[PDB]
Design a protein around this ligand. Structure first.
Ligand SMILES: [Ca+2]
Ligand SMILES: [Cl-]
Ligand SMILES: [Cl-]
Ligand SMILES: [Cl-]
Ligand SMILES: [Cl-]
Lengths: 291, 296
């Protein structure tokens, strides 16, 4: 496994729920970067350098993912709820003495991020979310066309062991199919092969895959309900926020419903903005987080 | 594999699209029985003897299922569309000299059946559908709770070879889990173990699995488009119809009967205490309901 972060340290950060693994580089105001599925912190390898020109950059494995520890789940999937993951990451940032920080997330990491902003807005100076809408909104959108396009939200959420049994037969195929499927190219050409190997190695462990299904189960159940409470209470994120989305991945209209100070832009990209479109993504993040 | 229809004959019926395998028995008016997923013709073995006391019973493997031939599919999943399957079975019944017949279907076979009624009503005296709503209605009703409850429609419809790869690792565990999950009890108790072994053997063949995924791909795309034309046109099935469903089955807020009255101008229906698999979970009632409906 390659080291894709030149001049970044490696840290295991203790919390009440388990260690968080992170690469740590740069100096300046703090900025936490959060990956999603089916990836690890390594998905920021092409944009983290440019950000570390200006910021202290903490590139973390989500709870249960990568090299972060795997908290024991329960019947409500609690530790893989976005609320619980945000709590845990707030504790990890406290271990570094960071109680007010900038945050960027992609995919599941972006869900942790907007949940963090809704639960504990005082922790954040600014927030960016990459190629997501809120979990509640994707579910409200779940008609035939969405059921088909985002099938994994229902499949990965089926009760255990149904997805875990299926994924065990050829995990490398499934992780690669997901990576490829959501890019513009439709193949793995946007990805550094070294990064792909990190994603494959993680995905090859049955325990890591179970956690991913627990995350999707939370996505179907508790995370949806948590979001529902906020949309019913009329709660909006007050933190200044950026919504980036892939031309092939209006979103800004959705996020204006959820957030009182939001700006946004498309990027010519599939889902995987930091790897498909690293210059445009890095440029937009530096410009937002600098201001 | 066991013979679950002792005394019934066996026919391999040629058609332009491929052979249809069937068991044939009884005497009287012709009645075609069509299974669905993940099963074969054997799922009728508990009701067939009873129906055979009053009808000439033709128990057919769907195109691509069981021992029927597997046509090569295409980008629109054509041979595994219900419209194509109906055409094919019309041909198979004409090889037997049946141009006007009664029909009962379950699951995919029920979908073939109502599409056959929409396309070619003159072929049918009467039709019964077991534990389904129209494909259009499944999709239109889609929301978070239905997506989570019945996920396989969207999963198996993913582009090849994604479901095929995932199902190839441990096919037995998937087929058996589906069978159990859809019953009232949630286990395999309702099924004769010899019938389970027919289903398992069929499912163990990668080609048969690919057919089942093409059937669900048709279900997500062309079948859905064919139904949408009909419902947007206000076309109703004119053939007298029965809708039977399981109280704990797969088939809406509205009862299934109320869904079907939108699609059919002469429809009756009833629930049975059962999961999805009416002819195995509730054979006596299912047989009774059918004999009464088709004999009236
Ligand atoms: Ca002939
Ligand atoms: Cl996501
Ligand atoms: Cl999203
Ligand atoms: Cl249905
Ligand atoms: Cl019964």
């Amino acid at each position: 496994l390659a080291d894709l972060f030149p001049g970044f340290g490696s840290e295991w950060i203790n919390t009440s729920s388990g260690r968080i693994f992170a690469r740590v580089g740069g100096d300046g105001p703090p900025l936490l970067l959060l990956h999603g599925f089916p990836q690890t912190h390594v998905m920021w390898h092409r944009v983290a350098p440019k950000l570390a020109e200006r910021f202290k950059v903490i590139v973390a494995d989500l709870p249960g993912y990568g090299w972060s520890d795997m908290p024991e789940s329960d019947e409500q999937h609690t530790p893989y709820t976005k609320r619980a993951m945000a709590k845990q990451l707030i504790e990890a940032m406290e271990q570094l003495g960071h109680v007010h920080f900038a945050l960027a997330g992609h995919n599941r990491g972006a869900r942790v991020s907007y949940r963090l902003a809704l639960d504990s807005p005082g922790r954040l100076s600014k927030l960016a979310v990459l190629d997501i809408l809120p979990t509640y909104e994707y579910w409200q959108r779940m008609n035939r066309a969405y059921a088909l396009k985002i099938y994994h939200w229902s499949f990965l959420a089926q009760p255990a062991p149904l997805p875990e049994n299926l994924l065990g037969g050829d995990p490398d195929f499934y992780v690669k199919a997901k990576l490829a499927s959501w890019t513009r190219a439709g193949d793995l050409s946007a990805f550094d092969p070294r990064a792909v190997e990190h994603y494959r190695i993680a995905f090859a462990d049955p325990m890591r895959r179970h956690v991913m299904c627990e995350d999707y189960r939370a996505g179907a159940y508790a995370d949806f309900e948590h979001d529902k409470i906020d949309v019913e209470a009329g709660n909006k994120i007050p933190v200044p926020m950026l919504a980036l989305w892939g031309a092939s991945g209006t979103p800004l209209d959705v996020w204006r419903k959820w957030a009182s100070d939001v700006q946004g832009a498309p990027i010519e990209s599939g889902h995987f903005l930091p790897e498909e479109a690293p210059d445009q993504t890095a440029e937009a993040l530096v410009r937002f987080f600098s201001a």
